[PDB]
Design a protein around this ligand. Structure first.
Ligand SMILES: NC(=O)NOCc1ccccc1
Ligand SMILES: [Cl-]
Ligand SMILES: [Cl-]
Ligand SMILES: [Cl-]
Ligand SMILES: [Cl-]
Length: 346
């Protein structure tokens, strides 16, 4: 066990191993607090998050376990990775606080989206799809891909962030808000059971915005956003209408006048024809028919970067716990086991 030291950072008591030095606050929220630090063992600048109230309810305790399970699994160049997890507790009986450590990320895709060449868009979207092939191979769905969740460094290298965090509230999804502009229509409106194809819709929205500099579907509310979507991709045919299980949602959609799919070459004026082709294969209303991440990596738009021998898949991820019912202290004991069993990366 390392030696820990204590200090108070903006009304919070932080107790961390000696290896972490020069702590300084970076952010706060309902989730907890974050500090930047220097890791003397590895030489990295790191971000350290102290969870707030990790075991205060069954829902909170299960969420803490979920976040730790997801972060411990992710071992890919284009996905956030866990550098360390620790607790000052010396036994399960005194276990209360959880600290998570990752690389310090500077800019997200907002902080750049600058003047992006088509070569920049190729490389950025290639890296998102390489990370998604990995995530999807483990049956993990992100559900919240947007520019603020994509970290980028000075060399244009990209990582996908935000796994296992608290679900977005109803009020966070209301009105003229980027928290909804990238969501697939079937999850925005609870049309049906969704699956991993929801993430490819988000990639299409991100790629369009990198090419134009403008939000693709900046709706002022759920219904305005759906109208913007159907104007571009067309109203649904009877094939897709069958698959909408909500009779109420089906009824509403049929109340709208029918519209054909627009010509994407006239929407994305001047863009690479191969980029236009890929956007048409991502932004398909029927999720059954969207291109997958593994398929999109092989599209000609990425010929400069595609290497099928360096696009790895994930180890299997057992998420049977998600359907399991447990008491607060049982979720907490499961979390404790995962803290003490952590093996740092090479
Ligand atoms: N869950 C997730 O995707 N990231 O949260 C882990 C984390 C965030 C900031 C600083 C240190 C660790
Ligand atoms: Cl130490
Ligand atoms: Cl503790
Ligand atoms: Cl965003
Ligand atoms: Cl597993």
């Amino acid at each position: 066990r390392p030696t820990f030291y204590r200090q108070e950072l903006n009304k919070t008591i932080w107790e961390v191993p000696e290896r972490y030095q020069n702590l300084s606050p970076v952010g706060s929220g309902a989730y907890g607090s974050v500090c930047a630090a220097f890791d003397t063992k590895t030489g990295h600048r790191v971000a350290v998050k102290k969870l707030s109230r990790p075991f205060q309810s069954i829902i909170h305790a299960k969420r803490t376990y979920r976040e730790l399970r997801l972060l411990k699994h992710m071992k890919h160049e284009n996905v956030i990775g866990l550098l360390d997890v620790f607790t000052p507790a010396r036994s399960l009986e005194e276990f209360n606080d959880v600290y998570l450590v990752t690389h310090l990320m500077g800019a997200d895709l907002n902080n750049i989206v600058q003047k992006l060449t088509d070569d920049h868009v190729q490389f950025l979207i290639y890296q998102i799809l390489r990370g998604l092939k990995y995530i999807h191979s483990a049956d993990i769905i992100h559900r919240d891909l947007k520019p603020s969740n994509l970290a980028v460094n000075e060399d244009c290298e990209l990582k996908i962030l935000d796994f296992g965090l608290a679900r977005h509230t109803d009020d966070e999804m209301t009105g003229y808000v980027a928290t909804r502009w990238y969501r697939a229509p079937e999850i925005m409106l609870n049309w049906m059971h969704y699956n991993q194809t929801v993430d490819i819709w988000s990639v299409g929205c991100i790629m369009a915005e990198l090419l134009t500099g403008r939000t693709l579907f900046p709706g002022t509310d759920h219904i305005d956003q759906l109208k913007l979507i159907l104007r571009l991709v067309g109203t649904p045919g009877a094939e897709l209408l069958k698959k909408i299980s909500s009779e109420s949602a089906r009824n509403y959609i049929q109340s709208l006048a029918q519209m054909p799919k627009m010509n994407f070459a006239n929407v994305f004026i001047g863009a690479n024809p191969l980029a236009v082709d890929l956007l048409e294969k991502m932004l398909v209303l029927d999720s059954d028919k969207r291109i997958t991440a593994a398929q999109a990596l092989a599209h000609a738009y990425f010929a400069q970067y595609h290497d099928p021998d360096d696009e790895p898949v994930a180890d299997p991820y057992d998420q049977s716990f998600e359907s399991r019912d447990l008491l607060i202290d049982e979720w907490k004991s499961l979390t404790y086991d995962e803290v003490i069993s952590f093996v740092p990366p090479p």
